[PDB]
From a paper:
PKD2L1 is encoded by the gene PKD2L1 (10q25) and was the third member among the PKD proteins to be identified. Moreover, experiments have shown that PKD2L1 can generate a large tail current in the depolarization–repolarization process, which further indicates the propensity of PKD2L1 to form a nonselective voltage-dependent cation channel. PKD2L1 is thought to be involved in the formation of functional channel complexes with PKD1L3 or PKD1L1, two homologs of PKD1. Of all the members of the PKD family, we found that PKD2L1 is one of mostly widely studied channels that can form a functional homotetrameric channel when heterologously expressed on the plasma membrane.
To understand the structural basis underlying the gating mechanism of PKD2L1, we determine the cryo-EM structure of mouse PKD2L1 with C4 symmetry at an overall resolution of 3.38 Å. In order to enhance biochemical stability, we truncated large portions of the N- and C-termini of PKD2L1 to form the PKD2L1 (residues 64–629) construct. The PKD2L1 (residues 64–629) structure is composed of four protomers with unrecognizable EM densities around cytoplasmic domains and allows the visualization of residues 101–563. The polycystin domains lock onto each other on the extracellular side, stabilizing the homotetrameric ion channels. One of the key differences between the structures of PKD2L1 and PKD2 is that the S4–S5 linker in PKD2L1 is invisible at near-atomic resolutions, which reflects the flexibility of the linker. Structural comparison of the pore domains of PKD2L1 and PKD2 reveals that PKD2L1 has an open-pore structure. L641 serves as the constriction site (5.0 Å) that prevents Ca2+ and Na+ passing through the upper gate at the closed state of PKD2; whereas G522 is the narrowest site (7.3 Å) of the PKD2L1 structure, representing the more permissive state allowing ions to conduct. L677 serves as the constriction site (4.9 Å) at the closed state of PKD2; whereas I560 is the narrowest site (8.3 Å) of the open state, still allowing hydrated ions to pass through the gate. Structural alignment of S6 reveals a π-helix in the middle of S6 in PKD2, whereas S6 adopts a canonical α-helix in PKD2L1. In the structure of PDK2L1, oligosaccharides are identified on N241 and N207.
Numbering used by the authors:
A (entry chain D), B (entry chain B), C (entry chain C), D (entry chain A): 101 to 372, 385 to 457, 480 to 563
Write the structure that this text describes.
Amino acid sequence: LRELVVYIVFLVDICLLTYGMTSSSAYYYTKVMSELFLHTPSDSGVSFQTISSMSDFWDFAQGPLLDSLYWTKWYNNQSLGRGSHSFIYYENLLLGAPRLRQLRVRNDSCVVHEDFREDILNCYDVYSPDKEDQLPFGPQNGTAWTYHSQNELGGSSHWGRLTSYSGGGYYLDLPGSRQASAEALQGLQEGLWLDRGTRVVFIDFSVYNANINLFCILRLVVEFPATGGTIPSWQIRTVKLIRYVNNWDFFIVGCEVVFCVFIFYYVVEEILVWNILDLVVILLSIVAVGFHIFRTLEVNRLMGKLLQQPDTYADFEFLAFWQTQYNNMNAVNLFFAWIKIFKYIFAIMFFIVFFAYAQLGYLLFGTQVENFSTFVKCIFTQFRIILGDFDYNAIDNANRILGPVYFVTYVFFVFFVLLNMFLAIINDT
Amino acid sequence: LRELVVYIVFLVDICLLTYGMTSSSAYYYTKVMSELFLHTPSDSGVSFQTISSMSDFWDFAQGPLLDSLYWTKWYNNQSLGRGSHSFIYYENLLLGAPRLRQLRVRNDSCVVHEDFREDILNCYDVYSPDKEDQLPFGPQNGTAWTYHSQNELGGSSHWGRLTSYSGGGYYLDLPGSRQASAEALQGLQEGLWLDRGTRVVFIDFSVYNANINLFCILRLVVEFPATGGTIPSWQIRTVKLIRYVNNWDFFIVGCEVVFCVFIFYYVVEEILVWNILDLVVILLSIVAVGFHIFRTLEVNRLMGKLLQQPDTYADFEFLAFWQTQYNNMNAVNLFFAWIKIFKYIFAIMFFIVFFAYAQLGYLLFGTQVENFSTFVKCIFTQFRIILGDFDYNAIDNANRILGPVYFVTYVFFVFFVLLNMFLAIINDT
Amino acid sequence: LRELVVYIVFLVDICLLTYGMTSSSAYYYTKVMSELFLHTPSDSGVSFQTISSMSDFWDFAQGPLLDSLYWTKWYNNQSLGRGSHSFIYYENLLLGAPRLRQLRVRNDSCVVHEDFREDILNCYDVYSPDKEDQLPFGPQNGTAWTYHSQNELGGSSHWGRLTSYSGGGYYLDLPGSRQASAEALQGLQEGLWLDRGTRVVFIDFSVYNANINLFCILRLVVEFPATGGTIPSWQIRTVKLIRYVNNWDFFIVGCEVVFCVFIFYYVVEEILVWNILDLVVILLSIVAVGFHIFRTLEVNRLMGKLLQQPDTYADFEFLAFWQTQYNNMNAVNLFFAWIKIFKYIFAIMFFIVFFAYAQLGYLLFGTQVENFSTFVKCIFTQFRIILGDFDYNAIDNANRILGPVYFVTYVFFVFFVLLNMFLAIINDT
Amino acid sequence: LRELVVYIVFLVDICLLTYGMTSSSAYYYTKVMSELFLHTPSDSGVSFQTISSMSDFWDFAQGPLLDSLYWTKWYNNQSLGRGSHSFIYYENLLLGAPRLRQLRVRNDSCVVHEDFREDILNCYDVYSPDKEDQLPFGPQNGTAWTYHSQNELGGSSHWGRLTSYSGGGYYLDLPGSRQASAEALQGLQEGLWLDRGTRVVFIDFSVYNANINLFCILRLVVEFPATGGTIPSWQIRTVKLIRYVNNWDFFIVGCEVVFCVFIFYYVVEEILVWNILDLVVILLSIVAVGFHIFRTLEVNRLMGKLLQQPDTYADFEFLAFWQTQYNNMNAVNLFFAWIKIFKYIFAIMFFIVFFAYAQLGYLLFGTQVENFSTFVKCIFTQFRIILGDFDYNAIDNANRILGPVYFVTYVFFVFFVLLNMFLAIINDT
Ligand SMILES: *[C@@H]1O[C@H](CO)[C@@H](O)[C@H](O)[C@H]1NC(C)=O
Ligand SMILES: *[C@@H]1O[C@H](CO)[C@@H](O)[C@H](O)[C@H]1NC(C)=O
Ligand SMILES: *[C@@H]1O[C@H](CO)[C@@H](O)[C@H](O)[C@H]1NC(C)=O
Ligand SMILES: *[C@@H]1O[C@H](CO)[C@@H](O)[C@H](O)[C@H]1NC(C)=O
Ligand SMILES: *[C@@H]1O[C@H](CO)[C@@H](O)[C@H](O)[C@H]1NC(C)=O
Ligand SMILES: *[C@@H]1O[C@H](CO)[C@@H](O)[C@H](O)[C@H]1NC(C)=O
Ligand SMILES: *[C@@H]1O[C@H](CO)[C@@H](O)[C@H](O)[C@H]1NC(C)=O
Ligand SMILES: *[C@@H]1O[C@H](CO)[C@@H](O)[C@H](O)[C@H]1NC(C)=O
Ligand SMILES: *[C@@H]1O[C@H](CO)[C@@H](O)[C@H](O)[C@H]1NC(C)=O
Ligand SMILES: *[C@@H]1O[C@H](CO)[C@@H](O)[C@H](O)[C@H]1NC(C)=O
Ligand SMILES: *[C@@H]1O[C@H](CO)[C@@H](O)[C@H](O)[C@H]1NC(C)=O
Ligand SMILES: *[C@@H]1O[C@H](CO)[C@@H](O)[C@H](O)[C@H]1NC(C)=O
């Protein structure tokens, strides 16, 4: 019964270590930033979410995005007394400069069919890293008009709605004030910096809050499919990077070294079914150990760069990405750490036909309704239908005969099979 | 156990043949075109979905529809360098010309009642093909003002929300550029090309995407009932017609001939309960065989016509219609082909009263709520109520006494009968 | 087994008689008229549903309502060739003239409390027919400014959202054209025809469709509570009044006399448990017999009046009211007539506590959330909660402590009691 | 069986006493006032709910709020004949003057991190009563620019969305007419009366309805977090304070003394399991006794003040607060009083894992989705998921891998554990 007590001590160790990272003021910080950039219309009624075509994109970029970044003067039109830096909502510092970057696809990327070769001289295929266009275009001069590899821009794969994307492309870094920035983007509308070759466009920038201590790092990802049009999407992550606050941070250093003491104790007692869960928990634990040194190194380097050369994009997106997935790992560890307490204290006919419906629904619908438009989405759509959440209008207007047949037939299937499962389990009794 | 293996080979045959037709880039192609034509307002705030009366229709036709068809210049107001053809979203070619066509009903189509014969000199009845008005009207000159049979316009029945419609009517084919087109439709507003006689108005046009290979064929169907007003509706189908891409298309020809080899094998082994499913699967299989020759002939002919005489409507709607229903057939075949693996490895009291509620609900509601407005819609509405999806406000504001009596009473009926079914099945145990 | 056959003959008799009244084109007729009057905004963005205060009402009455009534010219601004009458959507005749009528409450209707007698010289209480103000006001001249009893205006009780209302009040009948009408309502804004005394305002008018045969009779009821503000509400009923169409109407006369033959047969065989249902069905049958003579008399009289003196309100609202409730009666008869085929072929602990929750929820909520704002609404709200339809945000923002306690506690109550019912019924087995 | 009868007499006593307080016209009174202040946009499209930043707040305060308070002239632009007082909707008197009051936080409230000390000279921390800034600011002159304790302003804690707030702060009391008021708030925009130090801003005012007898007391609470931006929120309570109406009020005095007679009878019979419920009911009863004297004293004093010095804020918010919570207490008493009739006539595996999901969901989501943003909200969110109310899009866009794993895994957990509970209970049978 002593190993139990020690185990509890482990639960409060991991508990304080993971709840040390969070903040109850995070949610409103995301909510405020997102509702600042996403929802604010331009004069043309162009929000970010509602971007349709390219001209809408330019109406957005030269629109709110240049007035929701650079704040200078108060609401009473009196100047704000902090020099030359842009404070979003007066309370939020803007780190470095924002960066656009684009991805292009090669001029002739496929074979136009034989009938149309008269009217169509070019094929720009869907994005795949094999076909990415590395040559310059436009006036072919600055870093906006000429390619850059994934090394020259330190970066990882962004994984969007269509397909994953590399880290290269034609970046531009907006200058400090507003006016110079508008001169830039106006310069990119002059020439065509968005043409048929374009595929993905990223806008990255990050913000640091002085009052509490948090970063809001955000990516605005607009995709241009081969079909034309646009698909806007966004990721906004708020993150506690610097863990130094007060002597409490030194209590967090002590907490960390206590934690590694614990894990060494648990590898000692480990080596000599539930022990599966043990080796997992310890595995993700020691994965979580080194990340703090990784982080302190990273932050030290970045704040080094921002210190040296302002008006230069400094990547917080990689660091924020791995910080948040680090938090996900801690969450799963902690959850298992609660499950572990218990250690210290015919269906094939259903699955086959189930996937058969997933497939059928994907074929009949899926060029109409989004919820069916891929296979996994079909699986979870059918699962919600079991749980009693569905939109029948969509299924019914996609195909107004086979729709009701699908819906009804599926309902009777699940209902009926579930029944036979009940009667079988009662037969076991 | 060998016939099993051969059967699996059949499953991968049909599998690759049906998944050969689809594309994962289809959904966004429909989504983009539909959100281009349907949702874009005019200056008057007139979307397509929101069309109310005739003047709204004309505000739409001379509105966005002429600016969401003809694209000429880039977003920077630089000319686009492809000659005279209209590329929607710059990536999508426009095939031929768009076509309006109308259906009229005869001047005196019924008997005005005896009381009103003083104030009402005309009856235009509901549309039925018996009463379709074949005489010219207006200035009585062009092909817009004079009837055309269903042969002179190759076409099949469109089946809309009210009733099915023929393929005849008074067509107009818009010219190439925008300006000439606006001159046309302005010419049709000058005279009354929509008058009390009108019933259905169709706008048909189709689009071919060069980057991927797909067609988006779309019909915009606005109905004018006898009651006045309008009911806008639409059908948008994206279709892979030309299956020739690369040598992979030749692997698709080999796949097809392998498939017919399979079906001949299965008629040989067939002729000498589950065999019901066998004869069905083979039936729809051989139905699916000839459609490819039918299609290659059709496409060959059409692209022949578009080749010969541009600015002439060339029907892709018939071909797209049968291509999509062909895909539905393949979907059902494939689904059965998955079910078939298993071959190789008191209620009357409920139904009577159920339909009795369907009828009651249709009579009490149904001049108010849409979900009840016909009989089949009542059946599926009550079925959703069983599944726990309903809008109680509607039922309650239609009739605020009998509404709750209907809803409650029905709930207790289904609940209670289901109970007695449980207790009965437990009695069988 | 012969009485069975005769009974079936009864089912097809009542079946054809009740389905003779309906029309499948009704729903779109209501939908079109309602979306014409209710939803069309004015220049100020004032729809009918969105009416807030009195100035909004006047912005509506002189707004769309005078342009959604009088139609004169086509969409091409060419005159329409039917003399002086107003055709709504060109297909719908307007019967007679529209009528406003108001209800007033007496000057000093209650006792102002003792503290405020200095600042408040008048009390206008809630509407009850005892306090209705019968004296003239304003310029005190026309029929708009002077009272009229419920006899001088033939009319019945309208039953709205707050309380039932009589048929008297200060009516005004709008003239024929638009311009004279605007002169009228402008004349009623000049003086105050809506002042603190006002309680209910009705706008009644009816429309006859020539193409099909139906009436759309509609009431727009705006209520001004004692609290101030407004509560707009509406009733739109489409009705087949004249049943004369063709010789088929004579087949309907034969059908009626066959029906009365049947009911006499059933009183003969009746007089000499399920017979309860028999006497009910026959009762509502013979109630339904005389209504046709009542109706033919009524319609004959009305069309007499419209024939004699146009530009005079002629009530179709009484007749439409009883026609629709007649249709409800036929619906219930027919439903029982289907049930009748079978003739020819611990809870107190739950109900007490249930009503106890209805009461509690009414007291805690109900000055906030509408669904709880009266007692019956609380009953059906809790019933939906059992059926899994609820809005938790409302309950939670009304009182953010007792709300979740109510919701959770109720859920466990119903869940748990239902359980004990299951185990009890299994004990009976 | 006599104590039963006497008990019923108790039920009708408490019944008439609690139903004496309510009114069926309350709901529309809240609904009307709330839809007057909350939803009415300004010229800039700024509603109250939609307030985003500070400049939006000022656009609201000088916007509708000064035109939804002071009513002078009728809708026909004729003057209203009640002197100098402002009648909202002409039927509602405005009691006293409205009051703004603010809360500030100290200049340097925390330690800026070491890296940023160059660009950031100030930390304004989250609100806690320890850090509240008591010094004057701005021109440092009036009662708007200088602190006031919680005694000098009689007031209690407001408990908002973020944290509880004290009653002190920098109040301003708007003058009588509109013009002087606009001069005031313009004077507060001139200087910065909202600066980085601000945290909460309250607008309090109350309204008395003469026709019925009720008060609508309302607080408009706008919060400025440390993160920037705003969180608007509101409380609107309608209350019957003065219970004097007619001789019926004297029947209410008799009712009260009868009630205390009852409770003395029940302490006599009390002193000599269900008796737990007895001592509770009697406890809250005698708590409810003294509140009437407390109230009559309070109202007497207030109406004394409003009598003496108009244009001075007189607090009805404290009194309304305790009146409504008094009504909540009566509601619970009455509910128990209905329950009481009956007196006179393995799970740990589920709860542990349940809270484990609450925690996991709070960590993974909760910086994205609101429903998860705190721990209790996670508990009730998961409880609704059990009851079949959820938004899957949110969970899925927060984290698009771990989201479905959370949702599915939780569903199988609850489903499966519930099953084993069924089979266990059947084993007990
Ligand atoms: C707003 O600021 C501009 C900055 O140049 C100034 O010219 C203008 O007078 C200001 N308007 C005000 C204070 O109303
Ligand atoms: C295709 O694009 C390239 C850009 O890399 C350009 O140099 C070339 O001229 C284009 N081809 C044609 C036929 O214009
Ligand atoms: C841009 O083009 C001009 C024109 O020759 C050239 O002088 C300049 O160096 C170019 N910019 C860069 C960064 O090379
Ligand atoms: C837009 O194009 C028109 C075409 O004639 C031209 O006259 C005008 O100057 C252009 N406006 C620009 C480039 O801003
Ligand atoms: C009815 O319509 C026809 C069109 O086919 C027209 O020729 C005829 O004159 C119309 N009847 C009357 C009475 O105007
Ligand atoms: C249109 O009417 C004119 C007037 O006579 C005629 O010359 C012309 O041929 C008509 N158009 C056609 C296509 O017949
Ligand atoms: C619309 O009708 C009016 C009626 O007087 C007329 O003056 C005007 O010219 C017409 N406008 C057109 C036909 O565009
Ligand atoms: C009350 O209203 C009546 C209208 O019937 C009016 O004659 C009377 O003068 C009013 N009372 C007062 C005190 O103005
Ligand atoms: C309206 O008032 C005038 C003024 O005396 C009067 O002549 C006229 O008769 C009145 N109208 C009616 C319908 O009595
Ligand atoms: C509205 O009231 C103002 C108040 O001065 C007055 O000048 C104006 O003429 C009035 N407008 C009307 C009655 O239309
Ligand atoms: C901080 O705010 C106070 C207001 O209480 C002010 O007196 C002081 O000057 C501020 N500090 C600095 C460094 O400006
Ligand atoms: C406001 O400031 C002026 C300037 O000295 C002063 O005279 C006045 O008394 C101040 N107001 C109050 C209420 O003290």
